Every structure is written in C-alpha cells, then in structure tokens.
Amino acid sequence: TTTATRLTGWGRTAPSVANVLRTPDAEMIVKAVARVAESGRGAIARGLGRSYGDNAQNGGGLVIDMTPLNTIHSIDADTKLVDIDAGVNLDQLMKAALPFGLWVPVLPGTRQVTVGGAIACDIHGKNHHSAGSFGNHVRSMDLLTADGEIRHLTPTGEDAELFWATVGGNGLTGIIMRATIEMTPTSTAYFIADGDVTASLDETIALHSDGSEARYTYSSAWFDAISAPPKLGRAAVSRGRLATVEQLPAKLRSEPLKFDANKYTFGPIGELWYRKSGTYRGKVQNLTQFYHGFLQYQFVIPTEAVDEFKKIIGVIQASGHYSFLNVFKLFGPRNQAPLSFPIPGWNICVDFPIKDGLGKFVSELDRRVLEFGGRLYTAKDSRTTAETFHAMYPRVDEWISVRRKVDPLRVFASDMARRLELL
Ligand SMILES: Cc1cc2nc3c(=O)[nH]c(=O)nc-3n(C[C@H](O)[C@H](O)[C@H](O)COP(=O)(O)OP(=O)(O)OC[C@H]3O[C@@H](n4cnc5c(N)ncnc54)[C@H](O)[C@@H]3O)c2cc1C
Ligand SMILES: *N(O)c1cc(C(=O)N[C@H](C)c2ccccc2)cc(C(F)(F)F)c1
C-alpha cells in the first residue's frame, strides 16, 4: 500500500526517501500507525508539501499523505463553523464557504495548504495583528495518537494542553484527521485597500507604530533590502479590510461573494510613478489583487527591540546577498501554543539566491535573531541547529514534556524532529 518516494520541502532541498502511504480511507491510516507502533524511525503526516523545511519528510520511515482525506463535512452560516477533513486545502475551503458569507479567518500567501498543515505550523497571514494565527480559530480537532486512539481536542477542554501542543507542533503529536474551524463572517469577497509608500526604514517603522495599524484588519508591505541607507527599508505598504456590500461598485453588488523595466524605471520619473502608483485610498480589490535555487529566510524580532531590528536589516543589505522579494509585517499578540512561531513584533521574509558563503552568513543571522530575542519559522527552515532553536523557543521543554506523555515510544518522527532534537 506504501510507495518508496523521494521527498523535499518546497525549497527542493535536503531530499530524503520514505514510504508514502496515500489512502482516502481513514481505516488504512489508523492501522498503518498501529503497524508502526508495534515495531523504528516512526511516521509523519504530510499535506500539500508547501513547507520549505524538512518537517513533512521522514527519511527511511513512514510518510502519510493526507490530501486524499479531503471531505468537507458541513458548513453552517449560523454557527460560523466548518467541519472538514485535515486533507482539505484552504483554496477549496475558501470556495465552498463564500456562498455562506463565511471567510477563512487566516489566509497565508498560497492557498495550496491543507488544514492539517495550517494547524501544525500554526500559520499566520496578512491579518495576524487583528486575528492571530490559524490555531486561534480551531474550535476542535480529532488527533490520531500513538496508541491508535482518536482524541477529540478542544482549546479550553481538559485536553487543552495537547491541543495547544498540536497547534504549531509540526505533526509530532500525531495525525490530525479532522477539525472544526470557526470562520469569519463576510458580506463580500472583496477588500477595500489603502496604499502607502515610504522612503526609508525609519519611515516604515514610524508608519507601523503611529496607531494607523489599528484601523486596518489586514496589513503587509514590500520592503527594500538592497538599497543603501537611508533608502534601505523603504516600503510599499498595502493595508485594508473586507468590504461590505454597500461599498462595492454597483456592477458587483449583484454578486458580492463571487470569486474570480524601461529607461525611466530607475530615474526620478520612475520614483515618482512608483510613489503615485503605490499611494491610494479606498481602492476596492478582490482577493487576487490584494494578495498579488533560493533560500527563504523568515524571522520575527520582538516589538520593543526596534533598534535591533534596524541593525539586522542593515547587516542584510551590506552582506552582499541581494533579496528582491521581501515581505514585512508587524505581528500582534501571540497565542498559548508553546511552539507557535508568531510573537508581537517585526516580521520579515527574505529570499536569498543560493550563492557562496550564504550558508555561513545566515548562521550569523540566526545568532543575531537569537541574541535579539526573536526566532525563525520551522515552515521556512531546514538548516538551523537544535541549540539555536531551543533557545529561540524557551517553552520547547514544556512542549517536549507534553509530546512525551502522548508518544512515549517515538511513533511520530521526522527529519526536522531529529535535526532539532524534538524527537
Ligand atoms: C508560496 C508560499 C507562501 C507561503 N506563505 C505563508 C504565509 O503567508 N504564512 C505562513 O504562516 N506560511 C506560509 N507558507 C508556508 C505554509 O503556509 C506552511 O508551510 C504550511 O504548513 C504548508 O501546509 P501543507 O499542507 O503544505 O503542509 P506540509 O508542508 O505538507 O506539512 C507541513 C507541516 O504540517 C504537518 N502536517 C501536515 N498535515 C498534517 C496532518 N494532517 N496532521 C498533523 N500534521 C500535519 C507536517 O507533518 C509538517 O510538519 C507559504 C508557503 C509557500 C510555498
Ligand atoms: N514572509 O515573512 C512572509 C511571506 C508571505 C508570502 O505570502 N510569501 C509568498 C512566497 C509570496 C512571495 C512573493 C510574492 C507573493 C507571495 C506573506 C507574509 C505575511 F506575513 F503573511 F504577509 C510573510
């Protein structure tokens, strides 16, 4: 029933060979786990493999593909609850739930992620500072544990601890079979967006600490990480909120929940265009418009350590490693998941062309991120060390304890668990 497959994350790196079970039958799944528990490198769940790291692979072990288990069981406009299999992806869920006036409460940059993957990495999106991360919206889940049993976890139940260990747990508490999400009510599929441009890193920080952020539910920025100061850190800021029907152009009010470089570019006229183009108010945009080899590196620095955040950006541009695609956002309050990535503060994504001395430069970045109280993201990472990770996540020991109570025999395991000593 299993097939030896060669697996990588989305980074197409650190490949490993595992036995990939793929069945729409939850019974084959439960019994495949029981077949790992009476024997040795254990088992890990895999979703759509959008995670860049090595969390959804398990060298010389069992990897269980969950995408066949993609039944949407029900959606209820009144309770706002959705009840689906872990294999359902968020694009699928988005499209099924619009007709009910329901919005997926946390959307990441690609909708090709499963619900299991969204929970296990506790993903965040453009609205983190107003909605939190994915785990905040899970009202229940069914977790296939090492003992072959299915446990029904809730956020505030008597199983709260294992619930919040599973959130952001990178699949190391067992297999999420099914969950119940509370959605966000919406009257349209549209955003009303305000656009802003900055000329300096200092301007960017100002804009994000002036209180304007509280007027928008969604907010993120494209961010210059190549130009030398004080042009370094200038940003195209896109902020907004879901539009109501009364704010749509009348052509759309009929169907409000529907879904579907020249010579000047670098001169003063180019700079002018880019400011004009990137500055606006109340622009209505659908989801696509408003959301628009390499080493993907993402960290967050606590809010108060702002000067340290600036320092790291300066180190980056002067490093000779150039990143064009840079997403900046200020996270809001965190949640009670010990291994949850987001904390309030300065979040950034950078894309580094694989190049000489880059591996060693990012190790230094790790040191800086750590020294400054921030952390990396497992959904992005494959190269950091156990010691660095354990120091970045001070509640890791708390988490490991929970994980030990629930999988004493190390039935669930992955490349990452072994690398980061989470096993
Ligand atoms: C283009 C792009 C844009 C992205 N943007 C964002 C973003 O804006 N915000 C953000 O937070 N992330 C973002 N990501 C990362 C992505 O959201 C996460 O890596 C997500 O976890 C991937 O989901 P998946 O179903 O592909 O999971 P996989 O990558 O297949 O698995 C990821 C982790 O989830 C676990 N898992 C999967 N299914 C289950 C299950 N059924 N039960 C238990 N554990 C399971 C796996 O074991 C593994 O630990 C982006 C990724 C890409 C490629
Ligand atoms: N990283 O801090 C980060 C990345 C995204 C994101 O959507 N990235 C994908 C790869 C993307 C790259 C280039 C253009 C479009 C999409 C989103 C965030 C967020 F915090 F959600 F805004 C952060």
- The answer to whether 42 and 62 are in contact (CB under 8 A) is yes
Tell me the three state secondary structure of residue 331.
Answer: strand
Q: Is the dihedral of CA 62, 115, 331, 393 positive or negative?
A: negative
CB atoms within 10 A of CB 134: 31
- How far, in Å, CA of 357 to CA of 362, rounded? 9
Reply yes or no: is the peptide bond before residue 230 cis, omega within 30 of 0.
Answer: yes
- Which of 106, 294, 327 for mutating ligand 2's site (highest number of atoms within 8 Å of CB)? 327
Residue nearest to atom 7 of ligand 2 (CA): 109
Angle at 92 between CA 90 and CA 98, to 5 degrees: 90
Resolution at which this structure was determined, Å: 2.6
Q: What's the CA dihedral at 161, 417, 334, 328 to 10 degrees?
A: -160
Q: What would the two tokens of residue 86 be?
A: 């872990």
- How far, in Å, CA of 350 to CA of 226, rounded? 11
Give how far Cα 54 sits from Cα of 17, 126, 354, Å. 12, 25, 18
Q: Where are the domains of the chain?
A: 1-423
- How far, in Å, CA of 242 to CA of 335, rounded? 24
- The answer to whether 23 and 67 are in contact (CB under 8 A) is no
Q: How far is the CA of 327 from the centre of ligand 2 (A)?
A: 6
The dihedrals phi and psi of 77, each to the nearest 5 degrees, come to -70, -20
Cβ of 298 closer than 6 Å to ligand 2, yes or no, is yes
CB atoms within 10 A of CB 76: 12
Q: How far is the CA of 302 from the centre of ligand 2 (A)?
A: 19
